[PDB]
Design a protein around this ligand. Structure first.
Ligand SMILES: Nc1ncnc2c1ncn2[C@@H]1O[C@H](COP(=O)(O)OP(=O)(O)OP(=O)(O)O)[C@@H](O)[C@H]1O
Ligand SMILES: Nc1ncnc2c1ncn2[C@@H]1O[C@H](COP(=O)(O)OP(=O)(O)OP(=O)(O)O)[C@@H](O)[C@H]1O
Ligand SMILES: Nc1ncnc2c1ncn2[C@@H]1O[C@H](COP(=O)(O)OP(=O)(O)OP(=O)(O)O)[C@@H](O)[C@H]1O
Ligand SMILES: Nc1ccn([C@@H]2O[C@H](COP(=O)(O)OP(=O)(O)OP(=O)(O)O)[C@@H](O)[C@H]2O)c(=O)n1
Ligand SMILES: Nc1ccn([C@@H]2O[C@H](COP(=O)(O)OP(=O)(O)OP(=O)(O)O)[C@@H](O)[C@H]2O)c(=O)n1
Ligand SMILES: Nc1ccn([C@@H]2O[C@H](COP(=O)(O)OP(=O)(O)OP(=O)(O)O)[C@@H](O)[C@H]2O)c(=O)n1
Ligand SMILES: Nc1ccn([C@@H]2O[C@H](COP(=O)(O)OP(=O)(O)OP(=O)(O)O)[C@@H](O)[C@H]2O)c(=O)n1
Ligand SMILES: [Cl-]
Ligand SMILES: [Cl-]
Ligand SMILES: [Cl-]
Ligand SMILES: [Mg+2]
Ligand SMILES: [Mg+2]
Ligand SMILES: [Mg+2]
Ligand SMILES: [Mg+2]
Ligand SMILES: [Mg+2]
Ligand SMILES: [Mg+2]
Ligand SMILES: [Mg+2]
Lengths: 244, 244, 61, 244
């Protein structure tokens, strides 16, 4: 045979490069996944991730309460935290023993897979009672926030999209939903409508609280070839298009 | 300038009246919200509210178990209440230490925003095992109950729609789902189908248990300009169309 | 005051007391503890030192 | 340049040796620290350390109770241990469920920094009710124990001073205070008296219970360049005077 890495007959090399290109392109086909992640960052350094993975379109929607830190199998000040929620829903509505609950998220990062169309991303960032914009009567039910998404890049390739916003102020108390649509550069929309209805049922969800960004990088992002951007603005993910 | 309240040049007056008219009309546009609330009333006077707010269409669906009273951070007879559920699912199926669980709802009120089309409202009031009408084989999956909805009115304006039913009997053990569609008096339905799929993801949900109808009025209904009807048949809400 | 003495203590409530012993071991020496959190919320976020107007500011240490 | 380690122009070598000499000499100046440690050794192998670090003079003073083992976040037989203290304070004064409390120290090691003047060391080893010598009326309030201190040495340099005494007998129940004065070979004492009063406020204290002598060596002594002597008579510390 020819010697490795010296000719156009390195079929092992060509096949490796096609395998990776096929994964990148398959994800982008209408047969492929589109995925979203919401990371909620807590003051003890822990991070809640919610992920949803589905064909065609995907999203996540959570209450104010559902985004607060929950420590499985430990104490959570559960009664005081009911009273904290009453004070957040309405000023002076509760009888809590703390000014600021450390279970409130300090920040949110929304990440989409590179198969999303960024122009289709929509976000409903509501107040603590789940109203998008002060009162229902004057609320558009979402904002199209794709312009704010930054490209997560590795080796020059877009591996995902990030929108990050801090919640550093006492008044930053939110409910949150986000949605994006898988790329579709074709003019095939229709015949497919019941398939999209089945995709709503077939979407797989995951949620877990990791103890630190380091652990999230090591045990969640990296093992699954997921894109991520850390607090130091470092990008994680795997470039695949035309690459060995 | 002209003197306030004496001429057609009170622009502050005209703008106030337009601001309110715009909120009422925006809510009714297809860009606006449609909202539903389910109130479950418990014998200790407390009320569980579930609210969902979304564009185009909205609904709520809950199990028998999910509608039972849950007191965050307090005792809930949790083991006995598992056994209560087994007896409700099948006669004599459980081993509970009580005849009637006080966590069962005594009544349900369904409220829609005034942006719903009442003729589109549908309800699936199932038995305790989540069957609409005795057995699945003979069940239509909903009833169209819009005729029973009463208009909640303030100053002559419809501020919302209410359907209220008591569950005063021992056999009143239900699962519940409800759905309505936002008004659409146009002939624009289609091109918009993936937007309606995103609305399913973008819908914001809220749930909380308030200790009394008074507290629900004061801290939930009123601060958010929501419509409500109390046990004394008193209407709450804010009239907006052509009003200062 | 010691490092430990400045950490938040909530009288008559839960304080994660065992985990917080392990947090102190990790603070005293990198990777010296076995705690279930990256950052203890009992750590001070800031300190303000105030003196009365009867102090001589040049003597403060 | 000259070649490393072959001439009087290895300025990196000279500076390293001066850096170390400066640290040893600075500690010995009146601007430097003097430090004391009391190690209380428990039968489960754990060790309580108390350290104080201050300018001019330093000491530690603890009750009988304060020297007993305390396991943070674990059970401590707290009620039985109150009764143990009553029996130790006065024969048959308590109602405890044990003959010997394993929280009693089995031994004490007192270590001073090499900046102390050993002739100034004083110790008040009291009985369990905090009397130096049987009855107050006949008690001198300390003993000058410097003659018993052994030199902890590394590479021929004194890195600290140790006095060690076992408490192996049932009657060895003590309260303890110790004090030493920083070296002062000058005839400058006076003008400085309010500075010494501020040093009483500025002294920094540390206390912690380590699970084993090994852990104390690895995580407390060694990382901080502290002197120590272990149960096998091995010396720990860092020699600095005229050394690279
Ligand atoms: N020294 C270099 N000169 C030219 N091209 C390079 C060099 N190093 C990497 N590249 C190539 O340039 C492109 C961009 O790679 P690069 O590592 O800059 O991107 P990234 O990892 O997204 O960004 P960054 O490395 O800045 O975080 C890739 O095709 C890569 O193979
Ligand atoms: N004494 C009155 N005479 C004529 N019109 C009135 C009088 N009081 C109020 N209105 C007007 O009549 C309309 C109906 O107001 P009204 O307060 O009756 O309605 P509501 O608050 O829905 O019902 P109710 O007050 O019976 O609960 C409104 O346009 C209002 O401004
Ligand atoms: N084989 C040797 N011959 C001559 N001098 C030595 C030798 N080994 C070490 N030294 C030097 O002798 C002095 C004493 O060092 P040494 O290691 O004996 O002291 P230490 O560590 O206090 O005691 P020990 O090693 O007995 O515990 C130092 O100046 C050192 O550099
Ligand atoms: N505003 C508050 C907060 C707490 N408590 C009381 O303090 C007790 C303990 O508080 P809780 O908030 O439930 O904390 P934990 O029991 O420590 O934690 P968890 O419930 O998550 O196990 C509760 O029984 C509650 O009645 C109260 O009266 N008022
Ligand atoms: N039909 C029942 C009801 C209760 N119990 C027992 O009584 C204990 C307490 O009852 P539970 O119903 O769990 O009430 P609480 O502990 O008071 O409340 P919660 O669990 O909500 O804190 C349980 O361990 C359970 O095994 C039982 O044997 N049979
Ligand atoms: N790193 C840790 C932290 C906690 N725990 C265990 O979890 C239990 C509860 O944790 P703790 O930190 O003591 O918290 P609380 O009991 O909630 O609070 P407190 O002790 O202040 O009342 C303890 O018995 C402890 O053994 C552990 O094994 N390892
Ligand atoms: N001489 C003693 C010792 C213990 N007890 C009783 O036994 C119970 C448990 O003993 P305690 O010594 O407090 O040990 P723990 O509860 O295991 O440990 P801790 O208190 O440190 O958590 C206490 O309520 C106490 O009243 C007693 O009557 N007489
Ligand atoms: Cl395709
Ligand atoms: Cl419209
Ligand atoms: Cl000096
Ligand atoms: Mg447990
Ligand atoms: Mg790079
Ligand atoms: Mg509790
Ligand atoms: Mg009226
Ligand atoms: Mg208590
Ligand atoms: Mg505990
Ligand atoms: Mg040696």
């Amino acid at each position: 045979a020819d010697v490795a890495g010296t000719s156009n007959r390195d079929f092992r090399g060509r096949e490796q490069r096609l395998f990776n290109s096929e994964q990148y392109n398959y994800n982008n086909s209408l047969n492929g996944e589109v995925s979203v992640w919401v990371y909620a960052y807590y003051s003890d350094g822990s991070v809640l991730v919610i992920n949803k993975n589905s064909q065609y379109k995907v999203g996540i929607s959570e209450t104010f309460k559902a985004l607060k830190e929950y420590r499985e199998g430990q104490h959570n000040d559960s009664y005081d935290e009911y009273e904290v929620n009453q004070s957040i829903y309405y000023p002076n509505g509760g009888d809590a023993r703390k000014f600021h609950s450390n279970a409130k998220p300090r920040a949110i990062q929304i990440i989409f897979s590179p198969s999303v169309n960024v122009r289709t991303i929509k976000m409903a960032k509501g107040n603590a009672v789940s109203v998008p914009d002060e009162y229902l009567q004057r609320s558009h039910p979402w904002e199209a926030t794709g312009i704010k998404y930054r490209k997560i890049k590795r080796d020059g390739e877009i591996v995902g999209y990030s929108h990050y916003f801090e919640l550093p102020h006492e008044y930053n108390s939110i409910s949150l939903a986000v949605s994006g649509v898988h790329k579709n550069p074709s003019s095939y929309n229709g015949h497919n409508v019941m398939d999209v209805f089945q995709s709503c049922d077939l979407a797989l969800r995951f949620c877990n609280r990791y103890w630190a960004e380091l652990e999230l990088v090591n045990h969640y992002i990296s093992p699954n070839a997921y894109p991520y951007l850390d607090i130091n603005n470092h990008s994680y993910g795997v470039a695949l298009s035309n690459r060995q």
